[PDB]
Amino acid sequence: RASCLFCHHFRLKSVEVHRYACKLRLLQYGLIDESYKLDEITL
């Protein structure tokens, strides 16, 4: 249900997904403070 059937990608913004991968990567190492600090990186 989460995929796109015409492109075969996830319907979430690619950069937003990459943000999610980043958070879960930081939580493999359990770096929580940085996991929350990640949201601030903005332009």
Partner 1 sequence: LSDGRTTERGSFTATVNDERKKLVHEFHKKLLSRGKCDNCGMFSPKFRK
Partner 2 sequence: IFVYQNNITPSAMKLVPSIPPATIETFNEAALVVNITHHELVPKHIRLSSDEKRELLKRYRLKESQLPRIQRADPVALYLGLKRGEVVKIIRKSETSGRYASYRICM
Query: Binder to partner 1 among 16, 40, 41, 42 (CB under 8 A)?
Result: 16
**Residue whose CB is less far from Zn ion, 21 or 41:** 21
Give me the residues paired with residue 15 across strands.
none
**Residue whose CB is less far from partner 2, 2 or 30:** 30
28/40 Cα distance (integer angstroms): 20
Query: Binder to partner 1 among 5, 39, 41, 42 (CB under 8 A)?
Result: 5
| Ranges of H-type helices in the chain | 14-28, 32-37
Give the three-class secondary structure for 5.
Answer: coil
Query: Under the rule (CB under 8 A), what is the footprint of partner 1?
Result: 1-7, 9-14, 16, 20, 23-24, 27-32, 35
